[PDB]
Design a protein around this nucleic acid. Structure first.
Lengths: 42, 11, 188, 180, 175, 288, 147, 311
RNA sequence: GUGGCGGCGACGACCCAUUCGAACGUCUGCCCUAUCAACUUUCGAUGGUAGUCGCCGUGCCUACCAUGGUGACCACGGGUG
RNA sequence: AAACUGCGAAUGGCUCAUUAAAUCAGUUAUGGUUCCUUUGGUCGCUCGCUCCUUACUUGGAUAACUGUGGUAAUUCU
């Protein structure tokens, strides 16, 4: 835990609202789940 | 308490 | 659009105002420090070759060699400040353009090459005097000093010569002898 | 900036102290010189008092001393094998003090052959004493010797050291073998 | 302090200079030299306050630039030169010699000396060390270093130095 | 004046078509041994006009040897040892005659940043020979011929005969200079120390050269009344170095078979001239 | 026991231990020559420090430290750190106003060389001043006398 | 071999790090080009229109890699070998924080504002950015993780491992969608399009992978044993750019025909291609930064439009 | 005779010592408040090894280790024209 | 005159925007470090392959100066 060896989950004041969620995904959510199930030999 | 991991819920 | 033409072999400069766009078209879309055959300037300029040294645009900003653009930029120039400089590419939006004649043509320009501008100052260091006059070690540099005659109205005529530096005189030899003597005294 | 002052530290009892001054010039610190292996690239740094510090950024050669035979020779550096402080320096091939490196053994072999007139490294009134332990002979057969750097490349600009021998040699060999 | 101060206030001057209080704010800060700042007598103080030869600082400067004062046989033109204990001052224009000796109250005294006595001085040995090429060196109290000293001379001994040559004539052992 | 002549020949496209090109190449090889750098670099350009397939690829490494700043770095990174070499095995035969002559010129003048002056001469010889220690005994022979050029006349003839005739064919008016003779012995001492494992074939002629000069110096040392006083001290130092190296050769090379003539030579030039007076000198300190 | 307990090889810096020798000398004994120095001031170097084998760069007798300054004494209180202990110095402070004394104490962290053994709680220790060896350690143990 | 690559008078002045250049990158707008290097680690931003450096900012430690979060130069995140993460606003240094273990590489997911740390630990750190709090960890069950990449098309996260296995995770619900098996570790990992993926190996092999088929579609082998640091995709000519220290290889996506090869004087720390242009930017072990123009690959950039006339 | 010797100064210069200091330590000693009784490890608190940086000694800093350090003899915290 | 070179401006002043051993007083250490200036020292060469006839002194530049110029615009250029 010394020198930040162990991860701590206190809120960070300066990092609050540093970015806004921006998404550009062409795939619809139903298509993603079907693709994820069939990934590789699965 | 400082080391307890927060739990998030899928929106 | 004005042209400042210089001939370094005679060292003569001349400013010419050329209002013809056709004459200046041959210089367009060319970078600086490039050799151009200036045949389009007129019948006097046949066989002449010119080099683009620099220039100023309509706002008076000079050109820089490194930058490659048709407009103005803001570069760090000399502790460096962001001065605005015009690009090196020659365009029609130039107030003045500088040219240096490198090759001489058939006929002579009445301003530049018919008359000669003499060099005003001779060498001062002894070795440079020896190199200029091809002197040997036995020749006396003091004989070959370039003297300047000078006369003004109401004044007695005079002639002045520079002081030779790096010239062997007995004072320097005495100083060297004294240094060697000091070394001997220290060892003793 | 990098400051190596003492007033940013907590007290012995554990209480914190509040500043009374801004950072001073004489308390400055400078970024570390991560000396890699490659063509020689060294930078000079002006320090307090007007002196100079040679900051070696990249090094490939250095002189090493064979203490048992008292033979100092200048040889190239090949690889970094062990570092007591951290394994990341071993991964990134960073040259620091007290790290274990591999050096070429050609000049030492040439000196031994020219001095004792006995073959070494070849495939299958006190007198001169030509005896070498088996570990050094094996290293010479491999063509690379294990050495320890004794100088600080980030301070003097050169990487000098000595060839590993004896109890230290098997200690470091055991450490290297256990690391794998 | 942020930086070294070049203005010595009068009240912070050594008490053995016998400076009065209403002359001015400042006192002459001695230049660096063979003696320490707190154990030296500046040339201006000795020349205008002790001997009354001068009236002002410009007056002391005019006196000094004529090369009339010699300290240990050498002409000094610095009016703030630090003169200390066992120092010999010669003024040939007035035909006068002084030796700086503490009196019973702890102050430098105006002690006139015979001109034959002014040819030598006494120094206290501070350091003995072997230099380059195995050459012994001796360092005194007045920053004088001498090569090839007598082997019997140790630390805390006293030596007599001839001012003309700067060489040891004899010595007194600490006993 | 020499640089002016060499510059125009460097700008010729086809040197083979030139008239008397055979003698030109011999002149260029001789000029590689020159002490001045500017002579050497312009000479190397004339050699590179002959676009020889073997010499040409190593052009950059050769030029860095002629540069003061990059000399020491180039020595390490131009390895010629057979185990690990920058030069390929087929290219060794052509490159080495160029390489040896360049290094010989550097050895005389300057082999690094601080290696100038008579005091640094021993450092210059040491640096070159350690670089040449990786070569074969055949390839090192080219450099040793250059090094021992002034003393070729001592090599001919049998060992005992050469020592005797050197004493007879001695004139006080003309001798090899003592300063140059001191350089030969200092160079020869470094050679025996560092490349002794490549010197077995060339060793017998070294004994001839070493013994002949030592025998001659003793001969002048007998005739002191006819020589200047200032010359006595250099001659004694020359004799001391000669005996020490014979001492070195006997100390090593235990299994080497010395011929009968060589045994006669060592007594002629080392033992007999000083053995009679040995009680006088050795008492203060052990003589060589 | 074994002196090699760290990730780096523990060695006494001023002793060269890779000198090659003839076989008859190797057959006899592989005894490394020990380095120790006289510290002066009338203190005697312990014997087991001479024939010891521990490696300590902060040892006053076998390490690279110098003893100069003040010499103090105290009572040993705690042995819980590595090669350093906590001692206590007791004294009386005088107040003029009521004209009496009050009892005060100081706690000092001092380095032990591994030489001083059989040290217990409450025995007298004589310590000497040296360069700062850590954040809070400036004194080294010079002499131990039993209670 | 008829490609006639040119080499560059001065397009941008002072395009010169003092000793070496570690990483070269370009902004989404194309307005700004960013570079970092030794010594006195700097971040230098060059404006394309002004043909000069906008600013220079020294840093405490060397930066392994950095990401331009904002469209312009405003918001930049630096990863350090001292486990330090430095955030830079438009003014300058903003905040600095540590990571529990050393970080090999990091990638940022623009949706959900989650930034992922791949480093010297089995677990891959997640840092939410809209709220400063560190999020719940994900356990990759692999001893060492080397590289990571996030697919732009459908938001798929894959992390490289030292064992040589690519593990694919889902940014939503934080579950392992799949895993892929393929002694050498994974040097470079890159996503292109919806369905195409590339794996770099330290032995020197480029393997093109389809998400649906375990077998590789094509494999390209560098003859040198040096690892390939960067793999890039060029859409217009379907050219895949694989770069190692010795040389840069550009070859066709299908059938593996080689377009051209460029060997410089010094080793490449990084390479970069200006969008929709034949201009190539390289970072070398040299104070100068290499600039190369390939007319065949694409047209000259707009800010360097006169370069076509100069040829 | 491109002889041989020389005086008194000015300026610059490697290193040692001295002067002026500057910077880190040792020891001794501070006002009110217990309705502040525990504190430090809340990005090192104490100590060990190696290293980076620094003009140098040093948790000053970083990796790998032990669980330490201070306290009613008033620690720690808060105040105090 | 102008211009080139060297030294100093970190001291004295003045000022409304911080602080319980953190500052501060006395003692004590430099064998754990830095130093402009003052003062005193120290400040020569045998030979050692560089060959034959720069140490009676070696090399490359740039200001001031002359002359031609651009813009609303600087002692900008």
């Amino acid at each position: 835990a010394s020198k930040g060896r162990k991860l701590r989950f206190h809120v960070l004041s300066k990092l609050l609202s540093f970015m806004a969620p921006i998404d550009h995904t062409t795939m619809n959510d139903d298509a993603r789940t079907e693709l994820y199930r069939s990934l590789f030999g699965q | 308490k400082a080391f307890i991991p927060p739990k998030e819920k899928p929106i | 659009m004005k042209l400042n033409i210089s001939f370094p072999a005679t060292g003569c400069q001349k400013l010419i105002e050329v209002d013809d766009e056709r004459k200046l078209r041959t210089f367009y879309e060319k970078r600086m420090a490039t050799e151009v055959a200036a045949d389009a300037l007129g019948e006097e300029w046949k066989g002449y070759v010119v080099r683009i040294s620099g220039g100023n645009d309509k706002q008076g900003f000079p050109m820089k060699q490194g930058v490659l653009t048709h407009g103005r930029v803001r570069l760090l120039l000399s502790e460096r400040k962001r001065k605005s400089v015009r690009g090196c590419i020659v365009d029609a939006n130039l107030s003045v353009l500088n040219l240096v004649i490198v090759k001489k043509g058939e006929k002579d320009i009445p301003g530049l090459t018919d008359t000669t501008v003499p060099r005003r100052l001779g060498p001062k260091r002894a070795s440079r005097i020896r190199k200029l006059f091809n002197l040997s070690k036995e020749d006396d540099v003091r004989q070959y000093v370039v003297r300047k005659p000078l006369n003004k109205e109401g004044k007695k005529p005079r002639t002045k010569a520079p002081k030779i530096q790096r010239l062997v005189t007995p004072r320097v030899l005495q100083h060297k002898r004294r240094r060697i003597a000091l070394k001997k005294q220290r060892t003793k | 900036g990098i400051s190596r002052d003492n007033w940013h530290k907590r007290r012995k009892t554990g209480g914190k102290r509040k500043p009374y001054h801004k950072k001073r010039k004489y308390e400055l610190g400078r970024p570390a010189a991560n000396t890699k292996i490659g063509p020689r690239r060294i930078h000079t740094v002006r320090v307090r008092g007007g002196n100079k510090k040679y900051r070696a950024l990249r090094l490939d050669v250095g002189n090493f001393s064979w203490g048992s035979e008292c033979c100092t020779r200048k040889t190239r550096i090949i690889d970094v094998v062990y570092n007591a402080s951290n394994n990341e320096l071993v991964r990134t091939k960073t040259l620091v003090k007290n790290c274990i490196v591999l050096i070429d053994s050609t000049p030492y072999r040439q000196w031994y052959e020219s001095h004792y007139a006995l073959p070494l490294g070849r495939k299958k009134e006190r007198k001169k004493n030509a005896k070498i332990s088996s570990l050094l002979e094996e290293q010479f057969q491999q063509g690379k010797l294990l050495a320890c750097i004794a100088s600080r490349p980030g301070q003097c600009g050169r990487a000098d050291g000595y060839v590993l021998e004896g109890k230290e040699l098997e200690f470091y060999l055991r450490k290297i073998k256990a690391r794998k | 302090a942020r930086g070294p101060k070049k203005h010595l206030k009068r009240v912070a001057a050594p008490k053995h200079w016998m400076l009065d209080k209403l002359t001015g704010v400042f006192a002459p800060r001695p230049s660096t030299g063979p003696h320490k700042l707190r154990e030296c007598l500046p040339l201006i103080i000795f020349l205008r306050n002790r001997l009354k030869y001068a009236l002002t600082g410009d007056e002391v400067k005019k006196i000094c630039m004529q090369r009339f004062i010699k300290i240990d046989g050498k002409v000094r033109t610095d009016i703030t030169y630090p003169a200390g204990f066992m120092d010999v001052i010669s003024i040939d224009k007035t035909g006068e010699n002084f030796r700086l000796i503490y009196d019973t109250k702890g102050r430098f005294a105006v002690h006139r000396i015979t001109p034959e006595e002014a040819k030598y001085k006494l120094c206290k040995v501070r350091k003995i060390f072997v230099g380059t090429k195995g050459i012994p060196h001796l360092v005194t109290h007045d920053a004088r270093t001498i090569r090839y000293p007598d082997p019997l001379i140790k630390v805390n001994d006293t030596i007599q130095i001839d001012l003309e040559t700067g060489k040891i004539t004899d010595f007194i052992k600490f006993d | 004046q020499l640089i002016a002549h060499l510059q125009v020949f460097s700008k010729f496209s086809n040197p083979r078509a030139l008239y008397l090109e055979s003698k030109l190449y011999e002149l260029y090889l001789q000029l590689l041994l020159h002490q001045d750098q500017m002579v050497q670099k312009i000479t190397l350009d004339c050699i590179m006009t002959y676009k020889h397939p073997h010499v040409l690829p190593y052009r950059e490494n050769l030029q860095r040897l002629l540069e003061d700043r990059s000399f020491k770095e180039e020595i390490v990174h131009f390895s010629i040892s057979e185990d690990n070499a920058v030069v390929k095995t087929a290219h060794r035969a052509d490159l080495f005659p160029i390489l040896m002559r360049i290094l010989y010129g550097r050895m005389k003048n300057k082999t690094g940043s601080k290696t100038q002056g008579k005091s640094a001469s021993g450092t210059r010889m040491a640096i070159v020979l350690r670089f040449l220690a990786g070569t074969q005994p055949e390839e090192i022979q080219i450099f040793l011929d250059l090094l021992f050029e002034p003393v070729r006349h001592f090599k001919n003839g049998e060992c005992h005969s050469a020592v005797i005739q050197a004493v007879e064919d001695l004139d006080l008016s003309k001798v090899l200079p003592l300063g140059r003779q001191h350089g030969i012995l200092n160079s020869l001492e470094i050679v025996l120390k560092n490349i002794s494992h490549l010197i077995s074939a060339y060793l017998p002629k070294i004994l001839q050269i070493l013994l002949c000069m030592t025998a001659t110096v003793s001969h002048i040392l007998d005739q002191r009344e006819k020589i200047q006083l200032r010359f006595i001290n250099p001659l004694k130092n020359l004799r001391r170095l000669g005996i020490k190296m014979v001492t070195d050769i006997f100390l090593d090379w235990e299994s080497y078979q010395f011929r009968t003539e060589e045994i006669d030579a060592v007594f002629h030039g080392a033992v007999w001239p000083q053995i009679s007076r040995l009680g006088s000198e050795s008492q203060y300190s052990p003589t060589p | 026991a074994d002196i090699q307990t760290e990730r780096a090889y523990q060695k006494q810096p001023t002793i060269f231990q890779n000198k090659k020798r003839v076989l008859l000398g190797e057959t006899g004994k592989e005894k490394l020559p020990r380095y120790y120095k006289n510290i002066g001031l009338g203190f005697k170097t312990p014997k087991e420090a001479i024939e010891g084998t521990y490696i300590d760069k902060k040892c006053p007798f076998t390490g690279n430290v110098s003893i100069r300054g003040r010499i103090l004494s105290g009572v040993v209180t705690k042995m819980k750190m590595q090669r350093t202990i906590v001692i206590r110095r007791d004294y009386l402070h005088y107040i003029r106003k009521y004209n009496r004394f009050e009892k005060r104490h100081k706690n000092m962290s001092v380095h032990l060389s591994p030489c001083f053994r059989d040290v217990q709680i409450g025995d007298i220790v004589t310590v000497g001043e040296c360069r700062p060896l850590s954040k809070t350690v400036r004194f080294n143990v010079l002499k131990v006398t039993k209670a | 071999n008829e490609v006639k690559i040119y080499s560059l008078i001065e397009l941008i002045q002072d395009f010169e790090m003092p000793t070496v250049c570690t990483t070269i990158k370009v902004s989404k707008d194309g307005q700004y080009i960013l570079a970092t290097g030794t010594y006195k680690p700097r971040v230098r931003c060059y404006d394309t229109y002004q043909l000069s450096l906008k600013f220079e900012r020294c840093l405490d430690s060397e930066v392994v890699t950095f990401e331009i979060l904002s469209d312009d130069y405003s918001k930049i995140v630096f990863l350090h070998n001292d486990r330090y993460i430095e955030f830079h606003s438009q003014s300058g240094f903003y905040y600095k924080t540590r990571i529990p273990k050393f970080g090999r590489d990091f990638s940022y997911h623009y949706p959900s504002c989650d930034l992922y740390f791949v480093g010297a630990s089995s677990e891959v750190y997640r840092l939410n950015l809209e709220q400063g709090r560190y999020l719940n960890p994900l356990q990759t069950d692999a001893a060492e993780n080397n590289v990571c990449d996030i697919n732009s098309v459908h938001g798929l996260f894959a992390t490289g491992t030292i064992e040589g296995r690519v593990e694919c995770w889902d940014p939503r619900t934080r579950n392992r969608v799949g895993l892929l098996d393929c002694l050498p570790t994974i040097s470079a990992l890159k996503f292109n399009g919806a369905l195409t993926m590339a794996v770099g190996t330290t032995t020197g092999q480029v393997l093109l992978y389809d998400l649906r088929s375990d077998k590789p579609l094509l494999v390209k082998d560098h003859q040198y044993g040096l690892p390939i640091k960067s793999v890039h995709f060029q859409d217009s000519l379907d050219l895949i750019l694989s770069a190692d220290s010795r040389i840069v290889k550009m070859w066709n996506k299908n059938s593996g025909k080689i377009f051209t090869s460029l060997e410089p004087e010094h080793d490449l720390n990084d390479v970069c291609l200006y969008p929709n242009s034949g201009m190539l930017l390289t970072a070398n072990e040299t104070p100068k930064m290499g600039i190369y123009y390939i007319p065949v690959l694409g047209p000259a950039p707009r800010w360097c439009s006169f370069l076509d006339n100069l040829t």
